[PDB]
Amino acid sequence: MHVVYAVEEVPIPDGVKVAIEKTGPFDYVVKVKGPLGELVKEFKNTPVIMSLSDGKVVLEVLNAKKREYALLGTYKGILKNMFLGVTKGWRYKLKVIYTHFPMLVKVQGNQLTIENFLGRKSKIVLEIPKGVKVEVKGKEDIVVEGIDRELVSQFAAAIQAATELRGEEKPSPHGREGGLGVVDGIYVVGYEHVK
RNA sequence: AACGGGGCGCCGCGGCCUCUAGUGUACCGGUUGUCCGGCAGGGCACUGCCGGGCAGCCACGCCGUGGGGGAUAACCGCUGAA
Ligand SMILES: [Mg+2]
Ligand SMILES: [Mg+2]
Ligand SMILES: [Mg+2]
Ligand SMILES: [Mg+2]
Ligand SMILES: [Mg+2]
């Protein structure tokens, strides 16, 4: 359909200061600061008009189609994650599951290393991005923390992907005559806030 | 079975001549028939034939011949509204 005018409002929580800067004809840079840190997000080439009103972020589209109107809900959802990111933080939880070979997960500096995955001599090494903290709880659980939910979720997804074999190395998911097969890996199990 | 780690080929490409192999009517030797009287030296038999062989050329010989980065394909995912 067609939208003459549509508006959305995102209430800024207490202690959070939001700055909106126009870096181009339709580009925006939104800086969000809270007790837990500062996030910076870019909204480039966008039809959404972004503005501040006494403690809210106002999002508007004018003369918009479905494509442009759909971006109001998206930007509201992104901004809400930013506000919760600087007040409560984001924690993604992962579970280590093995069948015969116990995996050894350790964090050394800014490297996350997984050893003995399926008894392989190769070592899975991942680079931990700035703003992400990884802690290994016992032998079964991994926790990824940060203020940028996109950054934190993406890294947690990378850990899970690193243990998913592809091509000729992919094991059969089901066993003989239909039981569970070789299902080893690290699986993202859920998320929650730090506070 | 596999990832990872270690070692080496085959095919192709580019060079090289130290080794080995081929050639080598440069060169040295042996020897057949005849002719120059004999010896020695030599002509011809299209290097007469046979053996060896430097240089050069050469392969059947030796040497070199890789990893990375970027954007992507098939797609797999994150966040994410309509
Ligand atoms: Mg050649
Ligand atoms: Mg000869
Ligand atoms: Mg004589
Ligand atoms: Mg004569
Ligand atoms: Mg002659």
Side-chain angles (χ1 to χ4, degrees):
Chain A
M1 47 65 237
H2 171 262
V3 177
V4 170
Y5 162 85
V7 65
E8 295 275 310
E9 327 265 22
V10 195
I12 304 172
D14 216 2
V16 180
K17 54 206 335 183
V18 185
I20 293 180
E21 142 179 89
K22 200 174 207 352
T23 49
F26 303 100
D27 313 297
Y28 282 101
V29 169
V30 175
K31 317 184 89 111
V32 176
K33 215 204 308 302
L36 295 177
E38 178 134 288
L39 292 171
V40 175
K41 176 107 179 122
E42 265 211 287
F43 300 93
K44 295 148 326 162
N45 202 20
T46 182
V48 175
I49 310 172
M50 325 201 45
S51 76
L52 296 152
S53 99
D54 82 1
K56 305 186 320 302
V57 174
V58 187
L59 318 167
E60 302 121 293
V61 287
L62 298 159
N63 203 29
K65 295 260 217 104
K66 141 164 200 159
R67 252 171 94 242
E68 292 85 329
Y69 171 74
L71 280 176
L72 288 185
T74 303
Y75 285 12
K76 182 172 179 183
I78 292 172
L79 282 172
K80 272 155 92 298
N81 291 344
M82 283 175 97
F83 296 162
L84 295 166
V86 294
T87 48
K88 311 201 168 184
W90 294 100
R91 166 177 304 138
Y92 271 84
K93 314 181 279 263
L94 298 95
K95 193 112 174 126
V96 180
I97 299 180
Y98 68 79
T99 44
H100 178 277
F101 291 107
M103 271 174 270
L104 183 284
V105 198
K106 91 232 294 176
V107 174
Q108 204 71 28
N110 71 358
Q111 319 286 316
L112 174 74
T113 59
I114 308 152
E115 281 172 68
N116 204 45
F117 176 55
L118 300 172
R120 287 160 142 232
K121 297 298 183 204
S122 62
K123 276 190 44 38
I124 303 174
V125 184
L126 304 154
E127 257 276 353
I128 308 181
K130 211 166 82 143
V132 167
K133 313 257 207 158
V134 178
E135 45 215 37
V136 183
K137 323 266 298 311
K139 288 190 280 53
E140 219 166 72
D141 302 271
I142 309 178
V143 159
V144 174
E145 317 248 43
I147 57 171
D148 191 333
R149 166 166 197 193
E150 290 220 3
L151 190 69
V152 172
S153 32
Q154 181 56 83
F155 185 67
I159 296 164
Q160 158 146 29
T163 67
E164 265 144 3
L165 309 186
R166 319 189 245 100
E168 218 88 355
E169 310 172 23
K170 200 195 262 265
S172 170
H174 70 78
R176 200 201 218 131
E177 69 58 27
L180 218 55
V182 174
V183 282
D184 294 41
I186 314 174
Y187 301 94
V188 184
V189 298
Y191 60 99
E192 73 196 30
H193 296 295
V194 170
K195 306 314 198 17

